[PDB]
Amino acid sequence: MHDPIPTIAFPDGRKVPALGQGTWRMGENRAKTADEVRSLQTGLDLGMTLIDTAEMYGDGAAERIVGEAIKGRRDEAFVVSKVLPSNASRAGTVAACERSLRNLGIDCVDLYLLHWRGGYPLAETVAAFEELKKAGKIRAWGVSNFDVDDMEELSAVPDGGNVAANQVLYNLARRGIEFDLLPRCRAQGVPVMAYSPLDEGRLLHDADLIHIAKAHQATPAQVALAFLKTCSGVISIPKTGSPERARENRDAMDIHLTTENLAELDRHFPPPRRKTRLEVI
């Protein structure tokens, strides 16, 4: 019997498991599709109910993978997608949402993000998000790759205070948001979605993570996710094309990092001591 996935509440009171599933680079290889679908199905069965995708991921292909994986079980998934900033005009956003819904094969996304900051004024994009919400086409909107200054601009936008999430880079190797952005979003009640929680796999070569993994009879990936589980206000979205890895990632929740593991990680992966430029992938 494994331990449960902690839950995080959105501003609107909806709760999701703090461990979800990524999909970037899915749907690029026909030979992997069956496994990618199965990986997401496996994570859903195990309670990794949030799935993060985007219009740009394989230009609709990752969305279609998500659509397969949720076939017969839409109500079990919390589907997140995104609009590219070059599409995030008043009419563009609506048109992009409709494509995503067609690809996903569903009526409504749970959460719809601006993927990063572009040249269209924020009020335009938020206006489109609020109309989609009223139309029953999205349930909530948020943003991604927004630093503090970007977050502040939302207050000048009417309805900008409805922001439901900020999806930014965060893992042991990229702790910059701890200085300012994460504390702001926590004070504000806005979940931070930590993308690339395994630093795209680069963390898995780290000797201190390996050592700590060894002590817990776990894997380095499981340790990287166990750390992020300790962080309140954070939802991590690791991606894997492998159903065996999905199971492994789920079981990262059974690790209880000790006070000494945490000190050692802080020593090996130092927190920012000053404001850091937002890292983006």
Ligand SMILES: NC(=O)c1ccc[n+]([C@@H]2O[C@H](COP(=O)([O-])OP(=O)(O)OC[C@H]3O[C@@H](n4cnc5c(N)ncnc54)[C@H](OP(=O)(O)O)[C@@H]3O)[C@@H](O)[C@H]2O)c1
């Ligand atoms: N908003 C944005 O701008 C943005 C940017 C980046 C990412 N994201 C989202 O965040 C998700 C996660 O980040 P990411 O995909 O960039 O990288 P990541 O999840 O940190 O790591 C991905 C890599 O780790 C491997 N992996 C996963 N679990 C493993 C395990 N237990 N053991 C060993 N290797 C493991 C995967 O390989 P296999 O697939 O071969 O197993 C994959 O190559 C993306 O899929 C995407 O949904 C959003």
